[PDB]
Subunit: 106 residues, 4 copies
C-alpha cells in the first residue's frame, strides 16, 4: 500500500502487543507486522525519491527491513512458546530498529 | 502475484545467479527473490487449501519463508561485499529450503 | 576442546536428533552443537595453518559457524514449542551448512 | 574467560567501535565481541545460581546471547563493506540487547 499504512500498521500492532492479554493477539499482531515490513522493503521513500534503486542509500534503507523481519520472526517463536511477557519484551525491543532507519531515512 | 508467479520468480533468478558474471547480477536477482519470498507466504498452497489460516500446517508453511528470507539476506550481504563467487554458493545452498518445503507442502 | 573433537559432538548430536522420540533430547543435542560451535569458531583448521588470524578465508571460516549457529538457534525454537517433527527436519537442513564448509576448508 | 571478563570485553570492544577511524578496527572489535558472546553462553549467572541448567530462566538467558551474536554477525558485513558509519549504528543498536539481558538477569 502507501508506506504510511504499513508504518501505521507496524505501529498499531506494537501498541496492540503492548496492550495484548495473551499469545493469541501477539501472534496475529506479529503476523500483521511482518506482512507490512515486507510490503515496505520495496517502496522508494520521500527522502530518497532521488537516487536510483541500486545505491548505498537504497540498499541500506532496504537492509533495515531484514533486521525487522528477523526480530519479528524471533518474537513470534516466543509468542508461540506461550511466553507472552518475553515476546512482548522482544516487541518493545524492535523500537530500536524502527528508530535507526527513521534517523537516516525519514 | 500469486504463489506460482513468485515460484517462477524464485527459480528464474536462482538460474540468473548460477550464470551471473558479476555481483550486480546477483544483487538484483536476490533482491527480486526476497519480495517473491514474502509475497509467497501470504498464499494458501493448494495442498493445504482446506486448512484454516491459523493451523500447525499453515504456520509451518509460512515459517519456511522466513528461513528463505534470512538466507537471501545473508546471501545479499555477500553480494554487497563484492564477493561474486560465495554469494552463488550461498544461493545454491538455499535450494535445501526450497526442497524441504516442497518435500512436505507441495 | 579442538576442531576434530568439536566435529564429533556435532556429527554425534546430529545423529541423536535423527532418531529421537521427544523434545528434551533434541533441545539437549542442539545446545551442545552450539557450544561445540561456540568452541569450534575460535580454532584454526589444518588447511589454514599458514594463514593469519585476519585472513579472508579465516573470516569466511568463522562465518560458516554463525550460519550453522543461526540455524541451531531457530532449530531450538521449534523444539521449545514441542514441534518434534519440524525440529528434526530443521536439524536435517544443517547438513547443507556442514557440506558448504567442507568443500572449502576440511 | 568468565562472565565478568566476557562482559568487560563486550563493553570495551563496543567503545572501541564508537571511537573508530576505519573499518578493520570495527571488523576486529566486533570479532572479539563475537568471541566473548560465544564464550559467555556457558556461564551461569549470580541471579540464577539457584536455577537448573535446563530451566526457563537459563534457556532464556542463553537465548539473550543468541540474539546478540546475530546482531554481531550482521554488524560485520556493513563493516566488511567499508560501511563505517552504519556499522557503528549497528553497534549502538546492540545496546538494546545489552540492556534487555541486564534488566531481567543482572
Ligand atoms: C526504515 C527501514 C523503517 C523502519 C524499519 C520502520 N520505519 Fe516507520 N517510517 C519509515 C519512514 C521512511 C517513514 C516516513 C513515512 C512518511 O510519512 O513519509 C516512517 C513513518 C512512520 C510513521 C508515521 C507515518 C506517517 O503518517 O507520517 C510511524 C507511526 C512509523 N513509521 C512507525 C514505525 C514503527 C512502529 C516501526 C517498527 C515497528 C517502524 N516504523 C519501522 C521508515 C521505517
Ligand atoms: C514453502 C515454504 C516453499 C519454499 C521455501 C519454496 N517453495 Fe517453491 N513451491 C512451494 C509450493 C507450495 C509450490 C506449489 C505451487 C502450486 O500450487 O502448484 C511451489 C512450487 C514451485 C515451483 C513450480 C510452481 C508450480 O507450477 O506448481 C517452482 C519452480 C518453485 N516452487 C521453485 C522454488 C525455488 C527456486 C525456491 C527457493 C529458492 C522455492 N521454490 C521455495 C512452496 C515453497
Ligand atoms: C566451517 C565453517 C565448518 C562447519 C560449519 C562445519 N565444519 Fe566440519 N569441519 C570443518 C573443518 C575445517 C574440518 C577439518 C578440520 C580438522 O582438522 O579436522 C571439519 C571436519 C569435520 C569432520 C571430520 C572429523 C573426522 O572424522 O576426522 C566431521 C565429521 C565434520 N567436520 C562434521 C561436521 C558437521 C556434522 C557439521 C554440521 C552440523 C560441520 N562439520 C560443520 C569445518 C566446518
Ligand atoms: C545476557 C544475555 C547478557 C547480554 C546479552 C549482555 N550482558 Fe552484560 N551482563 C550480563 C550479566 C548476567 C551480568 C552480570 C554478571 C556479573 O557477574 O557481574 C552482566 C554484566 C555486565 C557488566 C558489569 C561488569 C561488573 O562490574 O560486574 C557490563 C559493563 C556489561 N555487562 C556490559 C554488556 C554490554 C556492553 C553488552 C552488549 C554489547 C552486554 N553486557 C550484553 C548479561 C548479559
Ligand atoms: Ca507451473
Ligand atoms: Ca506476473
Ligand atoms: Ca574474573
Ligand atoms: Zn530467538
Ligand atoms: Zn500472475
Ligand atoms: Zn499468474
Ligand atoms: Zn498471470
Ligand atoms: Zn520465468
Ligand atoms: Zn553472514
Ligand atoms: Zn582430539
Ligand atoms: Zn524460526
Ligand atoms: Zn570462558
Ligand atoms: Zn543484515
Amino acid at each position: 500500500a502507501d508506506l504510511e499504512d504499513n508504518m501505521e500498521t507496524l505501529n498499531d500492532n506494537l501498541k496492540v502487543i503492548e496492550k495484548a492479554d495473551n499469545a493469541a493477539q501477539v501472534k496475529d499482531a506479529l503476523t500483521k507486522m511482518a506482512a507490512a515490513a515486507c510490503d515496505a522493503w520495496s517502496a522508494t521513500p520521500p527522502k530518497l525519491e532521488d537516487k536510483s534503486p541500486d545505491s548505498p542509500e537504497m540498499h541500506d534503507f532496504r537492509h533495515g527491513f531484514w533486521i525487522l523481519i528477523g526480530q519479528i520472526h524471533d518474537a513470534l517463536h516466543l509468542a508461540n512458546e506461550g511466553k507472552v511477557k518475553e515476546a512482548q519484551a522482544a516487541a518493545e525491543q524492535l523500537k530500536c530498529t524502527c528508530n535507526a532507519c527513521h534517523q537516516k531515512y525519514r
